[PDB]
């Protein structure tokens, strides 16, 4: 047997606000965080605009002297996983702290250091570039700046699966206490791609938007008229608890994680089957993960990023799944509001999910104003949409066909 | 409930050669792969040399098209994978595809492609970064093209944990199988950092050996004459396959994977505890996981990168495990003639603690000419010692406090 998974907290960085609490605020008033990139020259390029995380104090989470040892991408991750640890009330002790753990994830990791030490490297030679550069920039200092901060001595990893990191990332968290490897695990994704390399490398394959005089509708998904995803910075971070360590020390408890799911598509490198073929198998794995029937589904909040492809495979996948169900359940893109913040993508929509299930209403997809041939099922189109929601779906889909499927059920 | 978990297929590029027989040919006979860098000039660079993969034909395993636009880790991670599929004689049909999945890893991943980007972006724009800057650099394309290419539908992902990420990637594709979430993992790690960003950012941090002046030298792990790792390129990936299929389809099984460990340090972002707290904690974790006796173990392939703290750490952690038990057992650092190929390490190390249960070996350390104080274990200095070998342990350590343990035993 198997034992059980629930979440005890939660914390986050996003477009719409530097916690949970604000995020979520933003996301059922269908607010966008979406606005031109401000302190950096993008004249020369064909995007201009993106969610970037507004006013972030670093110096909330680390000393000034620490701070400048890491990555943006790095802070990130640490300020959502210290925020849900806090949320968790959790007491790290000598008893308990070889069974806590870390899984943080990045899909792109360091690339606005790696930039500016290239500006160095290129215009002075190597001796300019920063001692801290390596462990500065590599994905897997968050799990190990957290480990080391709080004294973690669990499972300590990184995944990186793209634009599905953050969807992974706590589904493998819940396999390890799952299978009894760990009692806790902090579990998501940070990004912060925002640098030239980043608008650059996605503009150059030309899957962004281009919408630079209306950014706020620049992210529609479904909608006819979109051209391309929104790049968006900011972490999620969740405390992921076995459930008998959870009620034991009257831990508050969101909601309870019942399945998860895996699959590739072994498809394409960027490019999704039209079909749906492999996110229809990673939900399919991911509801028998949770000995549930397609019929009990009642929300999925969508990878939806915008693209002419991606958008639609996801509508050909749900209707394959859910059948005569497909119309019943509520699907929404909140990147419709926040953008696509990649590896941390799924870690921000996992817990989007929980406070689904929390609220009982279906997050807006906003900017759906003409919904394109085939895109008609329940997309809660512009508002919010109080709802029954016992069981909901987190989809993520990424470059190298990798597919990632969370199923969340009310816990009471 | 648990399932078995053998090795029936290896691969490998390392500075030994392109394959996994000519390398071993190199680990038996003692031969460093170390010299001169010849790929750029590194007149500016306080270090010089490493472990180049020499001669390698991409043009063997891929189109001249799709590999001019893939990093060079991609590449050998793709050589090593197709390497062991082959080695495996495991056919991919509609029957078992979407059992059979892949995690392959990497430390930095595109560093190489990341600078050339970096240099168009600097001195032209970003309209000359290329537009498959980010499918072809991004760590999880490893695992995404080999899928696409044999058309692999189970568990994709990629680990990314430093120095460790080898041994993590082989060790959690065993918990995919061994928890039936898959039959077959392809699993290991690819490495290719000898660019500017990777010699500087190692050189800015004074991690590497400077012995520009006589390079096979400069790996001597637990030599007191050590001055840091040396940086070595390649790719190690294996096949791992469930017990009963392995049996059933009458693959050829070099050996069982009985034992994994992870723990995390919570001490260091970049230093290892001298007492090896972190490393003991994790080869305990991972012979407990075995249902081993430590007295069982006759060969550890130690992490042994000749660094002054990291080698001395590693002694104080095989006193501290196996006690008296520590003067039977032989243990040795391949890095001695491979150098340390950072997130491959554990892959082509693991591939070499199999072939010491093959071929009943003990690796030699090369260049032990004075063992440090407190090194006075069997280091296997200078020659390979041919031995009884049913146990083999292979260790990582990385940044992060990051620790990973594997234990294969032979299997008949
Ligand atoms: C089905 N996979 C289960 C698993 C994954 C990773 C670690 C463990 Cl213990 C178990």
Redesign the interface.
């Given at each position: 047997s198997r034992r059980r998974v629930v979440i005890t907290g939660m914390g986050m960085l996003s477009p719409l606000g530097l916690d949970v609490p604000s995020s979520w605020e933003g996301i059922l008033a269908g607010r966008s965080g979406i606005a031109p990139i401000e302190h950096m020259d993008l004249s020369?390029?064909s995007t201009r605009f993106g969610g970037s995380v507004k006013g972030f104090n670093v110096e909330e989470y680390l000393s000034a002297k620490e701070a400048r040892?890491l990555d943006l991408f790095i802070q990130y991750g640490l300020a959502a996983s210290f925020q849900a640890v806090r949320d968790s009330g959790l007491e790290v002790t000598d008893a308990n702290?070889?069974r806590i753990?870390?899984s943080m994830?990045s899909?792109?990791?360091g690339?606005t250091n790696?930039?500016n030490?290239?500006?160095s490297?290129?215009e002075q030679?190597?001796?300019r570039?920063?001692?801290?550069?390596?462990?500065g920039?590599?994905?897997?200092?968050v799990?190990?700046?957290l480990?080391?901060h709080?004294?973690?001595?669990?499972?300590?990893?990184?995944?990186?699966?793209?634009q599905?990191t953050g969807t992974?990332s706590i589904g493998?968290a819940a396999?390890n206490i799952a299978?009894g490897?760990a009692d806790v695990m902090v579990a998501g994704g940070s990004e912060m791609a925002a640098c030239?390399?980043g608008?650059?490398?996605?503009?150059?394959?030309?899957?962004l938007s281009t919408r630079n005089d209306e950014p706020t509708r620049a992210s529609r998904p479904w909608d006819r008229d979109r051209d391309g995803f929104v790049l968006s910075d900011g972490s999620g971070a969740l405390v992921l608890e076995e459930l008998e360590h959870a009620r034991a020390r009257g831990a508050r408890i969101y909601a309870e994680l019942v399945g998860f799911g895996?699959?590739?598509?072994?498809?394409?490198?960027?490019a999704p089957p039209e079909d749906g073929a492999?996110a229809a198998?990673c939900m399919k794995n991911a509801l028998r993960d949770a000995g549930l029937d397609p019929r009990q589904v009642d929300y999925i909040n969508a990878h939806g990023t915008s693209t002419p492809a991606g958008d639609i495979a996801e509508i050909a996948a749900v209707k394959s799944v859910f059948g005569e169900h497909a119309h019943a359940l509520s699907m929404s893109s909140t990147k419709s509001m926040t953008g696509h913040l990649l590896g941390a993508a799924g870690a921000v929509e996992a817990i989007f999910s929980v406070l689904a299930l929390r609220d009982q209403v279906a997050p807006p997809t906003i900017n759906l104003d003409n919904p394109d041939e085939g895109c008609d099922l329940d997309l809660v189109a512009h508002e919010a949409k109080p709802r029954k929601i016992d069981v909901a779906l987190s989809n993520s889909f990424?470059?190298?066909?990798?597919?990632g499927t969370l199923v969340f059920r009310r816990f009471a």
């Open positions: 020369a390029y040892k702290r070889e753990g870390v994830g899909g792109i990791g690339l790696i930039e030490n290239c500006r490297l290129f030679g190597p001796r570039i920063s001692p801290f550069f390596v462990p920039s590599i994905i897997n200092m799990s190990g700046f480990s080391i709080l004294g973690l001595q669990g499972p300590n990893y990184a995944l990186t699966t793209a599905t992974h493998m396999r299978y490897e030239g390399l608008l650059g490398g996605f503009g150059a394959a030309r899957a895996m699959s590739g598509d072994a498809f394409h490198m960027t492999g198998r990424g470059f190298g066909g990798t597919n």
